[PDB]
């Protein structure tokens, strides 16, 4: 079973910097898209940052501009770089990943922890 | 167009020679989705023979029955 | 200038019986076809953007099939009793030839991507598509350009053109349309399979289903068009004789058979768009939005 090792988080001052990792375990070569989740306290879990293979990217409202997120093909791995750090970005981050033709997207990670 | 919008239903492999002009009581214009020239000529013995409208005893044939 | 044999080979029977036939499925094609290709847009636009490259190729197939389809009414009408014959023929093959090109380029965006791990951005998927709807029509050129109207018939003026061109159109129909892209689809799903059934995916079952299930369903709906093309061709190409009978037995196959091929585009949403999870998903929330 591939599984998504998740590392990077960690505790920060506010306006510092994080960056966390994500990447597959297994080999599957069917993935095109990768992308972070969180979701803090008494809140949903939402989108943040994705980004396929092809180049494509996306991020939420709230978090552009501050966040960026790049990849590694072949190797199926995702790193965020998360600069100027708020408060209200206090979540637990998830790593997804997304697969070609089946179109499923139940590939998930353990859930890094990120306080501000 | 494609086979399924077709209105030809009549198809010629080979003109008549032999000709009575006094054979003849009608005779039906070939179809224009057929795409290809040529007149069905209906006999007094109720048969039916395609007949190439590029010679000269057709337009004469043709001019005796569409009078008579 | 013996009894002569040139009585003419009549079709009147063949044509009235195959009529009913026709005007039904071609009903059936445009109702289904319009709604599943509409869904299929309508699922990759409202809520959610387009995501992939998938998705630009998706949309193309669907606007394909929808512009297909579309054309079935117009010639409905023609069979019943402005409808210009070179402009409906055109829109008729393009369609045709778009969506087997799509299908094709579906296939080629899923190797380079799987095997040889070659990705391509939104931006240039359409412009590929911009492309392959340029080479459709190209392709789609001897098709209608020679189809005008006539004593309000279409019809093709066979008598101020060659005796091989019915044969080309038939031959460039034959492996443009099936030898081609099933040739592609057929090595590049081989492929791509060969690789995800031995990887450690955790879909790689479906995955592999659902590509044969695209190279099955193809075979069995346009197969039996042109292998009656290929004896269609052969008649032609005077390789085998043929009777008055012969000529009517080949004439309501070419006729019955291609109104099966047509069917083929109201199979391909459920092929490709919503035979994914996401997009299962997100319909059934739209669904449920708007009730
Ligand atoms: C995907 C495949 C297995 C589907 C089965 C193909 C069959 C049903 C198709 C393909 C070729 C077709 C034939 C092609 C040629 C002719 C000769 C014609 O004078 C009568 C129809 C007939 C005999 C067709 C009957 C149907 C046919 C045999
Ligand atoms: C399961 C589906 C996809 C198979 C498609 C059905 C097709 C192949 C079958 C069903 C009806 C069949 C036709 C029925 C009538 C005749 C008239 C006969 O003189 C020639 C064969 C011909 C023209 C058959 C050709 C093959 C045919 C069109
Ligand atoms: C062999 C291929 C069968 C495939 C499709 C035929 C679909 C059925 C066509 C139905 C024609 C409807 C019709 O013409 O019905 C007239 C009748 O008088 C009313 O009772
Ligand atoms: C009318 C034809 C509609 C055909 C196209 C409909 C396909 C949608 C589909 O099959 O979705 C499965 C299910 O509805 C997901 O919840
Ligand atoms: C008229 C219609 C014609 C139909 C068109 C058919 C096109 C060819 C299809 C498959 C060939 C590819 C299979 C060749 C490889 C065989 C061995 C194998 O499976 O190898 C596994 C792995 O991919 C090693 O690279
Ligand atoms: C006219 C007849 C043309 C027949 C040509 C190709 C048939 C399809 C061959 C390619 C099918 C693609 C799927 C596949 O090959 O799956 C293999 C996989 O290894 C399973 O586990
Ligand atoms: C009549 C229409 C049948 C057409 C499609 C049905 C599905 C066809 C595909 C079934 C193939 C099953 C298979 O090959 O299984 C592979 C395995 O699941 C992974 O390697
Ligand atoms: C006849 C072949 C029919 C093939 C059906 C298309 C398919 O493979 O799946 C259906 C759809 O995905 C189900 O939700």
């Known amino acids: ?116 | 167009q494609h086979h399924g919008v077709t209105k030809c239903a009549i198809t010629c492999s080979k003109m008549t020679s032999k000709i009575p002009v006094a054979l003849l009581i009608h005779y039906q214009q070939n179809q224009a989705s057929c795409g290809k020239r040529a007149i069905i000529l209906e006999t007094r013995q109720h048969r039916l023979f395609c007949a190439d409208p590029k010679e000269q005893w057709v337009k004469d044939a043709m001019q005796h029955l569409d009078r008579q | 200038d013996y009894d002569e044999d040139a009585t003419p080979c009549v079709f009147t029977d063949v044509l009235n019986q195959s009529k009913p036939v026709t005007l039904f499925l071609y009903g059936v094609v445009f109702l289904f076809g319009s709604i599943g290709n509409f869904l299929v847009i309508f699922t990759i636009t409202w809520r959610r953007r387009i995501q992939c490259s998938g998705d630009v190729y998706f949309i193309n197939l669907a606007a394909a099939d929808l512009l297909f389809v579309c054309t079935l009414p117009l010639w409905m009408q023609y069979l019943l009793d402005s409808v210009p014959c070179t402009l409906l023929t055109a829109c008729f093959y393009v369609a045709m030839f778009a969506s087997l090109c799509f299908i094709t380029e579906i296939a080629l965006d899923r190797y380079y991507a799987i095997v040889y791990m070659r990705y391509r951005p939104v931006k240039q998927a359409c412009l590929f598509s911009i492309f392959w709807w340029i080479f459709a029509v190209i392709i789609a050129i001897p098709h209608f350009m020679v189809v005008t109207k006539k004593d309000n018939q279409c019809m093709t003026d066979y008598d101020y053109l060659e005796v091989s061109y019915p044969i080309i159109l038939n031959v460039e129909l034959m492996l443009g349309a099936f030898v081609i892209p099933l040739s592609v689809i057929s090595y590049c799903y081989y492929r791509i399979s060969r690789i995800v059934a031995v990887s450690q995916s955790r879909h790689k079952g479906r995955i592999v289903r659902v590509l044969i299930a695209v190279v099955l369903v193809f075979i069995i709906f346009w197969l039996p068009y042109h292998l009656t093309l290929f004896v269609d061709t052969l008649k032609l190409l005077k390789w085998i004789s043929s009777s008055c009978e012969f000529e009517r037995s080949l004439k309501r196959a070419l006729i019955l058979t291609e109104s099966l091929a047509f069917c083929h585009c109201c199979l391909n949403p459920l092929l490709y768009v919503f035979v994914g999870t996401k997009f299962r998903q997100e319909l059934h929330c739209l669904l449920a939005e708007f009730r």
């Open chain 1, 1 to 116: 079973q591939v599984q998504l090792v998740e590392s990077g988080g960690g505790l920060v001052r506010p306006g510092g910097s994080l960056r966390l990792s994500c990447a597959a375990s297994g080999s599957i070569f069917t993935i095109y898209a990768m992308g972070w989740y969180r979701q803090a306290p008494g809140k949903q879990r939402e989108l943040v940052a994705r980004i396929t293979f092809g180049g494509d990217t996306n991020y939420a409202d709230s978090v552009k501009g501050r966040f960026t997120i790049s990849r590694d093909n072949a190797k199926n791995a995702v790193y965020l770089q998360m600069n100027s750090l708020k408060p209200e970005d206090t979540a637990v981050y998830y790593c997804n990943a997304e697969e070609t033709i089946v179109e499923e997207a139940d590939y998930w990670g353990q859930g890094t922890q990120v306080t501000v």
